């Protein structure tokens, strides 16, 4: 098997048959009696002799260590820093069970503070963040300062799966990717699945030598599943991508919001680098708190936007009761509805007359739009972020208005309060350098940030920022309020 | 102050001037240089001699201990320090805080780790996927783990009264499950302290109170013991516990929206106090309980609101195919009882009554409708005390004590009405009415029997209050019905 751009979307990266050289790996049977597999560098690091497969775990590791590892197993992978081996030495061991196999991963110990102490220091620096913007800004600076990586970013996954760089702390000499996007294909489903499963993903050396697991394919033809093994080797594609950037190493912290991958906190370094296990425990704890605090802020934000909308629509209902002419009130008031949700324009289409405000289509194109919604909707809110896919003629004005949300004012007449958004590329706040070129490998320019961003621009060409579930809930509240205004008007007139 | 039944609602329980005998207390100045106050038992427990006041902290505690405590004081809640050294080779569990201008140090003799015990308890409640399940697990779990004779959970009602919503007890004890106590049984100052402190400890309800020397200092100021866990108990509550047979207790406060949702109350029928490490764990457990309770409450609310929308959305689609909207409502009104908790429901349209479940008789509906027309401003009107608004409603208060009214029109006085029974009719009380209690000098007021009777009087002729969630559902329904009438006007 030879990974390339044709088949890399289905690469079995969970069973590479190699590990990274910053530790060694031993795979035992389910009960941890027999050594079934081992990495080739086990002899170097653990100071072991000849061939490990066939020997008992007690023989290889000692009675005392096996006893202790069986205890941690009984009580995600179990993280055991500063374990004492048979010789006069200390090792950071991680331990888990998946499929039938028990995988044991080893790292030379160092001198580290307690994980809980380090995590607690970090968490205390983001508790007082009272908005999502504040939290997202703090975290990249704080993580860079605590972990000591050259760049730290936060990606937020969009509705189509693309990633958006929403925060960045970098070395001053590096180029920026803040406000940049990458398309969904840059992270394949299998990689996303492992980001969802594992909190941390470590890469020590993008140009490092892959240490083989022996055997790669066992007596029965089965490969070793390394899904939860933190020493699992990296795809040649992503390694080439990192090399083209000049990145030698990385660590990701996954952000889990609704049991789903909201994004990543991505730490990159421009020379080989790995954190010790105790600092990785703390990073995992910090990631957990970051995700919870983000979720609280995100709800508070949502609740405040919905309540704002209700308060505005409530005020509008009371004003409207004192008006004999409802069409006139809307002609004067419609632009105030733009305040209810993010939009670049709003307009009123009543009795074949157009009144616009902000970035809208020209008045010639509105009849076509209103006619489409009349056929497409069943008398409730219709919305899209890709007008050209629905109405080919809309491509002409896509720069000014690529998306549309229509609120019906009547089930009899073809009247609408319309909301609009610009082409998403028009609202780019990219802080990067367009003259930054990139080195390439055998795969070519595909594996560079320049070409990734350009591919993303193509994926969203003639499209706007999608209408969120929150926006649609506000739209429904607005429709409902206007039905109420019309009915109370009918009652008294 | 000599507290009694006349004035116990305003008792300054934050400044009793005494502590409980299971530890000793030392009060220092703001910078922890000088000893200003000390409890009378400090000599016994700490092995010190003479009047401790006027001596330096360095003198009384030694140079090392003072240095270590000053470091802890830099680390907003009492610092808990288990297994601390005094240089006799004596271990003490020390709690430490600053409040007002006073540093308070509290000592207990020492005797597993907190994170391990809390961890085991939390794992036993993580998988609860309903408020009912969490509440039921927790009393059994806490009882088994902390070894108390009874564990209860109270949920505070909107009027301040507490309801016993869960219970784990010794089999020979009486049950208080499904019982209520009135707001007056926990005064505002006690509530404020329950909100401020996660744990409240009572080692001995018949134990002798150790005075704090001095109770009133040269300046005339008392010692504020609001965050001191050794703070002594009111004589009123001690008498209350003695009447029950309870000798000791530990409360864990449940905080939901920065507000006292309830307590996890542990009672014991002989003296009892948990060591500091176990109390740390209980505090950690209480924190998780509160968070997990909050997550389940939101899920429960979200599901009820979405259910209501799905029903109302279905009703809108069906109504589009009906030429007669009055007829549709006459056939469908009883289905609206599924939207929110209620004991009855009825339609009042064109001076015609159609009822279902526990409602007032048709005779009384004109009076009720007329009152809502005058009281409301065209939106949802609701009460849980009909007698207070309409005296004549006392006649049918047994059947219908609370009402929620949804206006169907601003021209006509038409309504969809929702009813609830007298709250005493829906009691599910598992206790024994034949269980009597002994009394002290204050009398039978300080007994569970009289408390429950007092609560019954406070809610007489009233129903379960209409919650903010019930009101949101009502507003969704009103709005839905307006849209039905409007779309009906459009095509007819
Ligand atoms: C056909 C397969 C491709 C592919 C596979 C993998 N990508 C993995 C990681 C990865 N890739 C990116 C993409 C980026 N796009 C950018 O524009 C950009 C910077 C400007 C980056 C860094 C990201 C963000 C990630 C993960 C997060 C991170 O490290 O920052 C990956 C997993 C690697 C692993 O095993 O750890 C695989 C496999 N990437 C492709 O582009 C295509 C062709
Ligand atoms: C005029 C003042 C009164 C008063 C004061 C205090 N009550 C405190 C605690 C307390 N009291 C109760 C009431 C109960 N009513 C019951 O029916 C009942 C059993 C079925 C009980 C236990 C409760 C629930 C509590 C909470 C503590 C616990 O559950 O153990 C209190 C604070 C004591 C302290 O310092 O810790 C004060 C002060 N209680 C009265 O009844 C009146 C008259």
Say whether residue B479 is in contact with chain A using an 8 A CB cutoff: yes
The dihedral over CA atoms of A343, A345, A349, A353, expressed in degrees to the nearest 10, equals 170
Ligand whose nearest atom lies closest to the CA of A445? 1
Burial of B160 (0-12, 13-18, 19+ CB in 10 A): middle
Structure tokens at B109: 């003799």
Alpha-carbon gap, residue A187 to A194, rounded angstroms: 11
Cβ within 8 Å of residue B376, ≥6 positions away: B405, B407
CA distance, residue A139 to nearest chain B CA (Å): 23
Alpha helices in A347-468 (DSSP H): 366-376, 387-390, 449-459
Say whether residue A75 is in contact with chain B using an 8 A CB cutoff: no
Contact residues of ligand 2, CB 6 A cut-off:
B 8-9, 13, 162, 176, 179, 181, 185-187, 190, 200, 202, 233-234, 236-237, 240, 249, 251, 263, 265, 445-446, 448, 451
CA of A187 to the centre of ligand 1 (A): 5
Chain mean position to CA A475:
27
Name the closest-CA residue to atom 43, ligand 2.
B185
A480–B483 C-beta distance less than 8 A: yes
Name the closest-CA residue to atom 16, ligand 2.
B448
Contact B147, B444 (CB under 8 A): no
Say whether residue A412 is in contact with chain B using an 8 A CB cutoff: yes
CA of A176 to the centre of ligand 1 (A): 17
> Within 13 A of A341's CA, how many CA atoms are on the CB side?
24
Give which of B305, B483, B486, B492 to mutate to test A binding, by max A Cβ within 10 Å: B486
B485–A480 C-beta distance less than 8 A: no
Sort out which chain B residues have CB atoms less than 8 A from A484's CB and list them: 479, 482-483, 486
CA of B448 to the centre of ligand 2 (A): 10
Alpha-carbon gap, residue A110 to A92, rounded angstroms: 9
Alpha-carbon gap, residue B427 to B464, rounded angstroms: 11
Alpha-carbon gap, residue B43 to B16, rounded angstroms: 21
- Give the experimental resolution in Å: 2.5
B490–A487 C-beta distance less than 8 A: no
The Cα angle at residue A195 between residues B125 and A76, in degrees rounded to 5? 40
Name the closest-CA residue to atom 32, ligand 2.
B190
In what helix (H) or strand (E) does residue A78 lie, and over which residues does it extend?
Answer: strand A78-84
Contact B158, B465 (CB under 8 A): yes
CATH fold label, B1-14+110-207+233-298+432-461: Beta-Lactamase (3.30.450)
Sort out which chain B residues have CB atoms less than 8 A from A318's CB and list them: none
Say whether residue A292 is in contact with chain B using an 8 A CB cutoff: no
A482 Rama sector, left if φ>0, alpha if ψ -120 to 50, beta otherwise? alpha
Sort out which chain A residues have CB atoms less than 8 A from B487's CB and list them: 411
B479–A484 C-beta distance less than 8 A: yes
Selection from A101, A106, A96 nearest residue A75 by Cα: A96
- Residue A252, SS3 per DSSP: strand
Sort out which chain B residues have CB atoms less than 8 A from A486's CB and list them: 486
B485–A487 C-beta distance less than 8 A: yes
Number of H-type helices and E-type strands within chain A: 13, 18
CA distance, residue B412 to nearest chain A CA (Å): 10
Alpha-carbon gap, residue A369 to A427, rounded angstroms: 23
- Assess whether the previous peptide bond of A215 is cis (omega < 30° from 0): yes
Contact A175, A244 (CB under 8 A): no
Selection from A188, A207, A232, A273 nearest residue A439 by Cα: A207
DSSP class of A187: S
Alpha-carbon gap, residue A97 to A229, rounded angstroms: 10
Contact B331, B325 (CB under 8 A): no
- Residue A290, SS3 per DSSP: helix
Which residue, chain included where needed, has tokens 């002609």? A331
Contact B376, B475 (CB under 8 A): no
Selection from A327, A338, A415, A337 nearest residue A377 by Cα: A415
B479–A411 C-beta distance less than 8 A: no
Alpha-carbon gap, residue B413 to B122, rounded angstroms: 54
A483–B483 C-beta distance less than 8 A: yes
Ligand whose nearest atom lies closest to the CA of B182? 2
Structure tokens at B167: 């219970």
Selection from B469, B419, B86, B453 nearest residue B307 by Cα: B469
Chain mean position to CA B93:
30
B470-489 as b/e, with b when 16 or more CB fall inside 10 Å? bebbbebbbbbbbbbbbbbe
Cβ within 8 Å of residue A30, ≥6 positions away: A97, A100, A101, A102
Contact B360, B443 (CB under 8 A): no
At the second CATH level, the architecture of B15-109+208-232 is 2-Layer Sandwich (3.30)
Sort out which chain B residues have CB atoms less than 8 A from A488's CB and list them: 410
Say whether residue B409 is in contact with chain A using an 8 A CB cutoff: yes
Structure tokens at B65: 């201990």
The dihedral over CA atoms of A225, A227, A231, A236, expressed in degrees to the nearest 10, equals 90
- Ligand 2: which of B173, B237, B239, B429 to mutate, most ligand atoms within 8 Å of CB? B237
Selection from A368, A354, A358 nearest residue A335 by Cα: A358
Selection from B97, B75, B107 nearest residue B225 by Cα: B97
Cβ within 8 Å of residue B43, ≥6 positions away: B49
Selection from A149, A183, A137 nearest residue A164 by Cα: A183
Alpha-carbon gap, residue B57 to B50, rounded angstroms: 14
Alpha-carbon gap, residue A208 to A210, rounded angstroms: 6
Reduced 3-state DSSP string for chain B: CCCCCCCHHHCCCCCCCEECCCCEEEEECCCCCEEEEEECCHHHHHCCCCCCCCCEHHHHHCHHHHHHHHHHHHCCCCEEEEEEECCCCCEEEEEEEEECCEEEEEEEECCCCHHHHHHHHHHCCCCCCCHHHHHHHHHHHHHHHHCCCEEEEEEECCCCCEEEEEEEECCCCCCCCCCEECHHHCCHHHHHHHHHCCEEEECCCCCCCEEEECCECCCCCECCCCCCCCECCCHHHHHHHHHHCCCEEEEEEEECCCCEEEEEEEEECCCCCCCHHHHHHHHHHHHHHHHHHHHHHHHHHHHHHHHHHHHHHHHHHHHCCCCCHHHHHHHHHHHHHHCCCCCEEEEEECCEEEEEECCCCHHHHHHHHHHHHHHCCCCCEEECCHHHHCHHHHHHCCCCCEEEEEECCCCCCCEEEEEECCHHHHCCCCCCCCCCCCCCCCCHHHCHHHHHHHHHHHCCCCCCCCCHHHHHHHHHHHHHHHHHHHHHHHHC
CATH class of the domain at A15-108+209-233: alpha beta
Which residue, chain included where needed, has tokens 């919905």? A306
Chain mean position to CA B248:
20
Nearest ligand 2 atom to the CA of B186 is 7
Ligand whose nearest atom lies closest to the CA of B442? 2
Contact A150, A270 (CB under 8 A): yes
User: How far apart are the two ends of chain A, measured CA to CA in Å?
Assistant: 77
Ligand whose nearest atom lies closest to the CA of B451? 2
Let me know if the fold of A1-14+109-208+234-299+433-462 is the same as that of A15-108+209-233. yes
DSSP class of A89: -
The dihedral over CA atoms of A330, A336, A339, A340, expressed in degrees to the nearest 10, equals -30
Structure tokens at B70: 């000053």
Say whether residue A489 is in contact with chain B using an 8 A CB cutoff: no
Name the closest-CA residue to atom 42, ligand 1.
A186
Contact B66, B32 (CB under 8 A): yes
- Residue A327, SS3 per DSSP: helix
Q: Which of A410, A411, A480 sits opposite B479 (nearest CB)?
A: A480
CA of B186 to the centre of ligand 2 (A): 5
Name the closest-CA residue to atom 13, ligand 1.
A186
Closest chain B residue by Cα to residue A492: B411
Selection from A271, A297, A275 nearest residue A284 by Cα: A275
CA distance, residue A484 to nearest chain B CA (Å): 7
Say whether residue A71 is in contact with chain B using an 8 A CB cutoff: no
A399-423 as b/e, with b when 16 or more CB fall inside 10 Å? ebbbbbbbbbbbeeebbbbbbbbbb
Contact A190, A13 (CB under 8 A): yes
Domain positions in chain A: 1-14+109-208+234-299+433-462, 15-108+209-233, 300-432+463-493
Beta strand segments in A87-244, E: 90-98, 101-108, 151-157, 163-170, 181-182, 200-203, 211-214
Say whether residue A257 is in contact with chain B using an 8 A CB cutoff: no
CATH fold label, A1-14+109-208+234-299+433-462: Beta-Lactamase (3.30.450)
Q: In what order do the strands lie in the sheet with A181-182?
A: A181-182, A163-170, A151-157, A261-269, A249-256, A200-203
Contact A181, A430 (CB under 8 A): no
Contact residues of ligand 1, CB 6 A cut-off:
A 8-9, 13, 155, 163, 177, 182, 185-188, 191, 201, 203, 234-235, 237-238, 241, 250, 252, 264, 266, 446-447, 449, 452
Chain mean position to CA B265:
10
In what helix (H) or strand (E) does residue A277 lie, and over which residues does it extend?
Answer: helix A277-320
> Within 13 A of A188's CA, how many CA atoms are on the CB side?
14
Structure tokens at B459: 């809610």
Q: Which residues pair with B345 in a beta bridge?
A: B356, B418
A491–B486 C-beta distance less than 8 A: no
Nearest ligand 2 atom to the CA of B200 is 36
Alpha-carbon gap, residue B252 to B287, rounded angstroms: 9
Structure tokens at B22: 């299971």
Give which of A483, A486, A489 to mutate to test B binding, by max B Cβ within 10 Å: A483
Name the closest-CA residue to atom 10, ligand 1.
A187
């Amino acid at each position: 098997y030879h990974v390339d751009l044709t088949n890399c979307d289905r690469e079995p990266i969970h069973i590479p048959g190699y590990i990274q050289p910053h530790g060694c790996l031993i795979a035992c049977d389910n009960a941890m009696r027999m050594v079934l597999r081992h990495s080739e560098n086990c002899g170097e690091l653990l100071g072991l002799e000849g061939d490990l497969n066939g020997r008992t775990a007690e023989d290889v590791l000692g009675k005392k260590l096996v006893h202790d590892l069986r205890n941690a197993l009984t009580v995600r992978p179990a993280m055991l820093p500063a374990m004492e081996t048979s010789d006069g030495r200390s090792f950071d061991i991680s331990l888990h069970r998946y499929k039938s196999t028990t995988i044991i991963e080893f790292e030379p110990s160092g001198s580290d503070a307690q994980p809980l102490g380090t995590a607690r220091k970090m968490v205390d620096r983001i508790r007082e963040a009272d908005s999502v913007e504040s939290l997202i800004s703090r975290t990249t600076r704080l993580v860079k300062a605590t972990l000591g990586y050259d760049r730290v970013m936060i990606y937020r996954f969009q509705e189509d799966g693309a990633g958006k760089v929403v925060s960045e702390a970098k070395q001053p000499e590096l180029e920026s990717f803040l406000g940049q996007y990458f398309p969904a294909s840059d992270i394949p489903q299998q990689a996303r699945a492992l980001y969802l499963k594992n909190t941390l993903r470590i890469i020590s050396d993008a140009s490092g030598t892959r240490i083989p697991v022996l055997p790669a394919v066992d007596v029965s033809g089965e490969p070793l599943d390394l899904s939860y093994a933190h020493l699992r080797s990296v795809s040649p594609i992503h390694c080439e991508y990192l090399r083209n950037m000049g990145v030698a190493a990385s660590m990701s912290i996954s952000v889990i919001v609704d049991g789903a991958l909201w994004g990543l906190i991505a730490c990159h370094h421009y020379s080989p680098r790995v954190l010790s296990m105790p600092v990785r425990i703390a990073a995992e704890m910090f990631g957990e708190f970051f995700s919870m605090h983000l979720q609280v802020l995100k709800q508070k934000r949502r609740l405040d936007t919905i309540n704002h909308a209700h308060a505005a629509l409530d005020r509008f209902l009371r004003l409207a009761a004192h008006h004999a002419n409802i069409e006139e009130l809307l002609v004067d008031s419609f632009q105030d509805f733009a305040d209810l949700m993010p939009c670049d324009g709003v307009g009123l289409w009543v009795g074949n007359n157009w009144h616009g405000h902000g970035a809208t289509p020209p008045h010639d194109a509105i009849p076509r739009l209103a006619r489409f919604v009349a056929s497409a909707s069943e008398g409730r809110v219709w919305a899209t972020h890709a007008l050209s896919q629905a109405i080919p003629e809309a491509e002409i004005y896509a720069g000014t208005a690529a998306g549309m949300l229509a609120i019906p004012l009547s089930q009899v007449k073809s009247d609408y309060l319309l909301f609009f958004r610009k082409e998403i590329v028009q609202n780019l706040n990219w802080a990067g350098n367009p003259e930054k070129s990139y080195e390439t490998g055998p795969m070519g320019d595909r594996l560079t940030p320049r070409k990734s961003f350009a591919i993303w621009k193509e994926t969203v060409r003639l499209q706007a920022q999608p209408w969120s579930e929150a926006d649609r809930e506000i739209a429904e509240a607005a429709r409902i309020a206007l039905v109420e205004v019309a009915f109370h008007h009918s009652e008294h007139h």
